[PDB]
Enzyme design. Structure first.
Site, PDB file in Angstrom:
ATOM      1  N   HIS A  41      19.105  22.815  10.745  1.00  0.00           N
ATOM      2  CA  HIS A  41      18.237  21.823  11.442  1.00  0.00           C
ATOM      3  C   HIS A  41      18.622  20.354  11.159  1.00  0.00           C
ATOM      4  O   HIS A  41      18.029  19.458  11.786  1.00  0.00           O
ATOM      5  CB  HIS A  41      16.782  22.127  11.153  1.00  0.00           C
ATOM      6  CG  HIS A  41      16.312  21.816   9.778  1.00  0.00           C
ATOM      7  ND1 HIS A  41      16.031  22.820   8.876  1.00  0.00           N
ATOM      8  CD2 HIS A  41      15.903  20.655   9.213  1.00  0.00           C
ATOM      9  CE1 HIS A  41      15.557  22.266   7.762  1.00  0.00           C
ATOM     10  NE2 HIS A  41      15.506  20.943   7.936  1.00  0.00           N
ATOM     11  N   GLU A  72      20.153  29.700   9.089  1.00  0.00           N
ATOM     12  CA  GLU A  72      19.699  28.324   8.731  1.00  0.00           C
ATOM     13  C   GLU A  72      20.668  27.610   7.777  1.00  0.00           C
ATOM     14  O   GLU A  72      20.297  26.513   7.313  1.00  0.00           O
ATOM     15  CB  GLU A  72      18.264  28.336   8.231  1.00  0.00           C
ATOM     16  CG  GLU A  72      17.602  26.958   8.314  1.00  0.00           C
ATOM     17  CD  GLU A  72      17.583  26.239   9.663  1.00  0.00           C
ATOM     18  OE1 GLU A  72      17.749  26.913  10.731  1.00  0.00           O
ATOM     19  OE2 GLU A  72      17.430  24.964   9.635  1.00  0.00           O
ATOM     20  N   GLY A 146      11.237  15.955   2.788  1.00  0.00           N
ATOM     21  CA  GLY A 146      12.165  15.291   1.863  1.00  0.00           C
ATOM     22  C   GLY A 146      12.913  16.280   0.980  1.00  0.00           C
ATOM     23  O   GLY A 146      13.914  15.843   0.390  1.00  0.00           O
ATOM     24  N   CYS A 148      14.325  19.359   1.998  1.00  0.00           N
ATOM     25  CA  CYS A 148      15.282  20.260   2.699  1.00  0.00           C
ATOM     26  C   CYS A 148      16.686  19.948   2.186  1.00  0.00           C
ATOM     27  O   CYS A 148      17.073  18.749   2.007  1.00  0.00           O
ATOM     28  CB  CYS A 148      15.143  20.239   4.221  1.00  0.00           C
ATOM     29  SG  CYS A 148      13.570  21.007   4.737  1.00  0.00           S
TER      30      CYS A 148
END
Ligand code: 4MB
Length: 182
Positions: A41, A72, A146, A148
């Protein structure tokens, strides 16, 4: 404060950079040579900022399992003048549960941040922001925006990168040794 925090600090001090994309600032784990990982992402493009330096992206691969399900994890090769310490021997070979993990973050917003998250479950399937996702690890800590890209470690193992939360639990994508055979 103890040997879990010792291993986490050793990883942060040598194997992390601050990555900036158009989607934000992320903790980024360097694994070997010029190869690093970031949550998919983050939407890595042709150019990324690495510790506030404009860096060409030589390759970016958004990993999916053999069912064509999102994992991911994006593997990025950076046009950087310096290699990472090779930490592939700290990556697990198989999916597993863990005790006593630490989540470590280093950004402009959260420098030198370490969180004892406790027991880590092989959760498996997660609908992550509407996207079906596999190989998710879960920990019962109220993680926030904050975090990730944050690194999930035990003593002697680098087991995942933080990709989300629901307010009460946090979720990491597994790192497996087989992602980084070259
Ligand atoms: C952003 S969206 O969720 O509306 N559409 C998507 C995007 C990505 C995937 C995936 O599997 O990577 C699935 C659906």
């Amino acid at each position: 404060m103890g040997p879990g925090f010792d291993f986490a600090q050793a990883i942060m001090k040598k194997n992390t950079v601050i990555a900036r994309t158009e989607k934000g600032e992320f903790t980024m784990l360097g694994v070997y040579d010029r190869v690093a990982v970031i949550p998919t992402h983050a939407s890595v493009g042709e150019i990324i900022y690495i510790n506030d330096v404009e860096t060409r992206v030589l390759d970016a691969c958004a990993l999916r399992d053999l069912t064509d399900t999102n994992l991911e994890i994006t593997i990025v090769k950076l046009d950087r003048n310096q290699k990472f310490r090779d930490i592939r021997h700290f990556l697990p070979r198989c999916e597993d549960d863990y005790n006593d993990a630490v989540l470590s973050v280093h950004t402009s917003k959260f420098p030198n941040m370490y969180i004892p998250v406790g027991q880590v479950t092989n959760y498996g399937f997660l609908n992550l922001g509407g996207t079906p996702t596999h190989r998710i690890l879960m920990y019962n800590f109220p993680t926030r925006a904050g975090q990730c890209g944050g690194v999930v470690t035990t003593t002697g193992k680098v087991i995942g990168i933080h990709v989300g939360g629901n307010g009460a639990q946090g979720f990491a994508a597994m790192l497996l040794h087989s992602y980084f055979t070259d």
